[PDB]
């Protein structure tokens, strides 16, 4: 009933970043969102620096090219797609919003693409108000993944090695 990804061999590219900090924080929140699944799966993540990947990151504000705009500070933070080819996969963030670690002011960019990564391998939203997945953002300062969130990626590519 459900797309997913043909074999658990992932590559990913930053092909743009953002002003708000500094570049190797930003591969950093980016690698350590994509561990939170590896974790708990068979899945592996590769990054490479060039040519095209499955899944290519991006920041962007209002229009940014695909027919899903965003919308200024506040409101929408990020979206991703479904497993498929093309723009399958891809991930883009707002860049119309304040990026941090969380705490001070912002968006912890690692919170919010911990979540886009969960659809890019083919995951939906959750009724569970304290899964991942919920629909709405929420800081915490010791994340941990719900049972929720566990049951549903193993569904999908079974349990880690
Ligand atoms: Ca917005
Ligand atoms: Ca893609
Ligand atoms: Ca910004
Ligand atoms: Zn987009
Ligand atoms: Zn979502």
């Known amino acids: 009933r459900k797309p997913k990804w043909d074999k658990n061999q992932i590559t990913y590219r930053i092909i743009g970043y953002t002003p708000d900090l500094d570049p190797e924080t930003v ?6 969102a994509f561990q939170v699944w590896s974790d708990v799966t068979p899945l592996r993540f590769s990054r490479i ?15 940014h090219g695909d027919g899903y705009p965003f919308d200024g500070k506040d409101g929408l933070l990020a979206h991703a797609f479904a497993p498929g080819t093309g723009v399958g996969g891809d991930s883009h963030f707002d860049d119309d919003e304040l990026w941090s670690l969380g705490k001070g002011v912002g968006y912890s960019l690692f919170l919010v693409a911990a979540h886009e990564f969960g659809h890019a391998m083919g995951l939906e939203h959750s009724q569970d108000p304290g899964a991942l997945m919920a629909p709405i953002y929420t800081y915490t300062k010791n ?16 349990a880690s090695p």
């Open 27 to 32: 591969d950093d929140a980016f690698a350590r």
């Open 49 to 63: 620096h060039d040519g095209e990947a499955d899944i290519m990151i991006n920041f962007g504000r209002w229009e």
């Open 143 to 158: 994340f941990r993944l719900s049972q929720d969130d566990i049951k549903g990626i193993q569904e999908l590519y079974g």
